[model samples]
Target: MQLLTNHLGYERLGAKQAILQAQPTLALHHADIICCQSGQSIMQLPLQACGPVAQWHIGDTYSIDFTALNICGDYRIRVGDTESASFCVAEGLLMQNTFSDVLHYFKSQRCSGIYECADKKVPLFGTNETVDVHGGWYDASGDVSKYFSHLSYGNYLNPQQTPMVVWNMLTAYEVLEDEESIADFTRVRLVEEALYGADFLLRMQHPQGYFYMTVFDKWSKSTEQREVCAFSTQDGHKSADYQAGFRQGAGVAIAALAAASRLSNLASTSRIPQCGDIKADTYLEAAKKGYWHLKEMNHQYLDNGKENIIDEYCALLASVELYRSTQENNFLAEARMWADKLMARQMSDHNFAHYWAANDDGSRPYFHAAEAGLPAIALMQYLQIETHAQRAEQCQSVLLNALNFELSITHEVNNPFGYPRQYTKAVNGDKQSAFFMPHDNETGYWWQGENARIASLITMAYMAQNTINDNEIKSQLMIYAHRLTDWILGLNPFDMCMLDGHGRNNPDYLPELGFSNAKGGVCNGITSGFENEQGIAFKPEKQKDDMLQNWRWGEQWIPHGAWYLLAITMQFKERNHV
Candidate 1:
C-alpha cells in the first residue's frame, strides 16, 4: 500500500546505492549494476535460485525486502527503462507501515477546508439562516428563538428542530481547527441561543409535561400543528374551523427531551461559560423527568399497538441519551426492552412496514400505515443499540421494502403530479389510504405541505438505501441530487422563488385551497391561488402576474435553496464516508 515519489536529480536507482543514498536518484547507471554473492553474478543466476532484489527504480525508487519475496529464491525487480535487478530472496512476512506512519501520511495530505461552509458560519437553527446569525426574511421581524417553540404530532416539528440544530452545531465544532476557542465564541453562542429558545418553549409547557401549540396558523405557526389537523383527502379538501388540541403522546416530547439532554451534555463537556454546571444539570434533570413521564404514560397506548411503537422507540432514544449523560444501566435496560417490543411489533404487510398505530386493548390489531421519515429515524436509532442488530436488521428490511414500493410507484405510475408520491395506505382492517400528495405550493417549491413530507421521505430513502458500496443506489441518489440542484439553480435568489409564486401559490393559476384560519387562506393565496388588485384572486387570469414575475427575478429565494443544496451535498458526503 506504500507509494514513493522520486525527488532527486536522476530517474532510477540500484539496490546497493539506493540503500546508501539518503535520497536516491533513479538512473540508468544504477539500474544496470547488479550485486553478486559468493563470486556469482546475480544477473546470470537462475530466476528461481536468486533470492530477491533489495531495491529498484521506476521513475521512483522502491526498495523490496527479502520479506516481500515468495517461495522462489529468485526475485526480479522491474525498472522504468526495462532494467531489472535480481537477488536471492526468502519467504517471510511482509512489513507494513505502523499506525503512526499512516496517521502521519493522512496528516500531510489532509485538506483543511473540506468541510467549510460557503459563508464560514453555521446556522443556529435550520440550515437556511444567514452568516451573521440573522433570521431569514420570513422571520425577519420575529425572534429567531421562536423557531423551536411549536410542536405537532404528525410533523415532529419541535423534536426534529432541536436535533437538527444540535447536529449542525456538532458539524461546525467537529471541523474547527481550534475547537476550544471556537467553542468559546461561536459554538457557545449557538448553545445559548438554543437554550434561550428552549426556555421560551418551557413557558408553554403544560402540566402533563408536553408543550402547548403556539400560533396555530399554518403559514406562521410550526409544521407540527398543521400535521395534527385532520382533513379529508378524497377531494384534497381540509376541514375549516375544526381544531384539535395537543395529543398527550410521548413521541414528540421524548424526542425533544433526548435532544435537550444531548445538547446539555455537549455544553457541559465543552465547558461553555454560559451553560454552567447548574444550568446544564437542570436541563438534564428535566429531560430525565420527561423520559420518566413518557414511560409512565406508555401504559395509555398499550392497547393501541401502532401508537405504542413510536412512543416506545422514542422513549428508547431518550433513555440511550440519558444513559450516555448519566451512565445509568437502567436506561440501557429500558432501551433494550423497547427495542424488543419494536421487533415483536414488526409485520409483513407492505414488506414489513411498521404499523403507524396499534390498539392496546387488542380491539384492533396493528395499524400498518407507513411514514418513511420517522421510521428512518427509528431504524437509525436502533442501529446504535449494541444488542439490537437482529431487530435493527428487521427494521432495515421494512424501510427498504417501503422505499422499493415508493420507487416503483413514482417511476412506474402516473400517480398524482407524476412525481414521487408522499403518503401511503395504513394496513389496518379499514385499509385507509395514507395521504401521498406532495406540497408543491410552499415557499420552497420542491415540496410544501404534504409534498415537503414526501421530499423528506425521498431524502430518507436515498440515505437508507445508498450504502457505501451500493453503486445503483448512489447513482439514483445523484440523479435526485442533480434534479434538486437544477431546480434550485432555476429559482430567483431575492424572493426565495421556486417555479411557484411567492409563499404557497401555484405556478399555474388555480383556485386557492382555503383552510380554517386567515393565515391558512393566505398560504393558499401564496401557494395555490393568485392575488389581484381586488385583493385575493381565486381565478388564474384575474391574479396579477407582476408579483409572480417579480418573484421569478428576485433574490430572497436564493439562500433557502442554497441551504437545501448544502444539506443534500452533505448527505452525499455522509453516504461515501467522505
Candidate 2:
C-alpha cells in the first residue's frame, strides 16, 4: 500500500486534507495512467492487454491515446487508494471547432448572406424583420397563448447592430480559411458596412445630446420616433410606463455612442481614417449628456423618497466609460462616489445587496435579490477605474467576496429563481440547509429566472476568474460555459426564436414556430416552464430522454445575446494560446 500526502494551502483546504489513505482500492493500467490525473487508481482498463501502470510523480506530464480510450463515457483513474476526477472522453465536435457550423447557420437563417443585408443596411434594422429597432418580439400569427407576452425588445441601440453579424461571420471565415485572402475581403467588407451603419446612427443624435429610440423607416422619410410616447396629461398625473422606456432609451443611446467611439478608435489606430475620424468626440459628448440625464433622473427619484441602486450602478458604468475616454478627474470623482455608494449598499456577508430600500433602513428594507453575479462585475469594472492602489485593493476584496458568495451556491440542481441557489455560511456551530429565494418583484423575478441572466453570470464569472487568475474558478466557469453551449446546441434553432408558450409542449414545435414568426418574450428567446422536480421556468431542455441541452434564447438579435457573444469571444481570445 502507498500513502500519499499534499501540503498545498493548509488552512485554506478547509476540513479536508489533500491526502490519500492507504486503504484497499483499484489500480491503474498503462492506458488509464496517461489519460488520468495522478493520485488515482484504475480498477479496470477497457483494453485487454496493456502494460503495468506508469509511475507518476507530482507535476509529471503524460498523454493519452484518445483514440484507444474511446472518448465516450465518464472514465475515472484510480490509484492504490484514491480516484482521480472523472472525465468524459467523447469525440463529438467541440464548441471552438463547431464555430463555423453555428456561424453558417446564423448567416444562412438570421442575416441571409454574410456580406449583404437582405433587408436594409440600417443599424439594428436588418436582424429580425418581425421586431423593428426598439420593438420587441410580437406574435405575427396573433396567437398570444402560443407566445410569451412579457418578452419585448430593448429600447437602446448598439453600434454592433445587425450588420455586425459580419463579425461572427468573419470569426468563422478566419477559422475555416486555407488562405488569408479568402477571408480578408469578407472582413474588410464587413468592417466597412459596420462603419457606415455606425455613422448613420451617430448622425441621428438629437442636438440636446441624446439619440432618439427609433429610426424612421428610411423609405417612409418620417422623423425618428420615440418608443415610449410621452404626451403631457392635463390631469398632471405622471406615467410610470414612461420611466423604463426613457431610461432604457438613454442607456441604448449611450451604449451605441460608446460602441461607435470604440470602433472609431480601433479604425484610427489601425490607420483606417478612410473609415472617418472614428467620430469619437461626437459620440462621447452625446454619451456624457445621456449619463448626466440618467443621473439627474435618479436624483429626482431620491428626492421623491426612492433610491434605485441598479440605475445608479448603470450610470456609474456609463461614467466609467466617459472617464476612460476623457481621463477627466470629475468623471472619475463621480464614478468613485457611486462606487462608494454601491459598496455601502452591499450586504454585510457580501453575498447580496439591498437592491431597493426605503428611508435607508439597513435591516429588512426590501432586500434586492442577488443579481446573477452582476454587482460583482459592476464592482470589478469600477475598481479597474480607481487610481488609488489601496482603494482598488479594497474594492477587489469586496468583489472577490461577492464572487465567493455567488459560487457557493452553484449546485447542479436548477434554482427556482433561475439563479444559483443561495448559500449561507454556517455560524456558531449550527448547520442548516441554505435556502435561495427568488427576487421579490415581478421584474426581479423575471430577470433572475431567465437563461439570459444565467448566461450573463457565466460570462461575468469567466471574466472575474480570469482577472483574478483563479484556476479553480476558471475551471468552474468553463464547465458552466460548456453546459450553456451544449444546452443551446440541442435546441431546434428556429424553435428557440419563438415565444415560450408556442413550444412549451410541442416536441415538433420548430416547424410551426420558425424564426420568421416567433415573438420574443421578456427573457428574449429563453423559454419559461416547469420541468420535473426542478422548477426551471428558464432552462435548457433534454436533447433526448438521456441528455440535457443548453438553454437557447430566441433568435432575434437582442443585446443580451450580443453581450454574451462579446463576453464569450473575449474569454476565448484571452485564454487561447496562439
Q: Which candidate number would show the highest lDDT if scored against the true structure?
A: 2
Cα lDDT computed for each candidate against the true fold = 0.32, 0.36
lDDT of 1 by residue, 341-446 (tens): 6555444344223333333432222221122344444455545554555655665565455445445434442221122332222223232222232222111222
lDDT of 2: 0.36
List, residue by residue over 476-506, the lDDT tens digit for candidate 2: 5554444333233222212132222222321
Cand. 1 Cα-lDDT: 0.32
TM-score to true structure, per model: 0.46, 0.54
Model 1 stretches astray by more than 4 angstroms: 1-193, 206-210, 213-250, 263-278, 298-317, 337-372, 414-418, 423-448, 451-455, 458-471, 474-478, 481-578
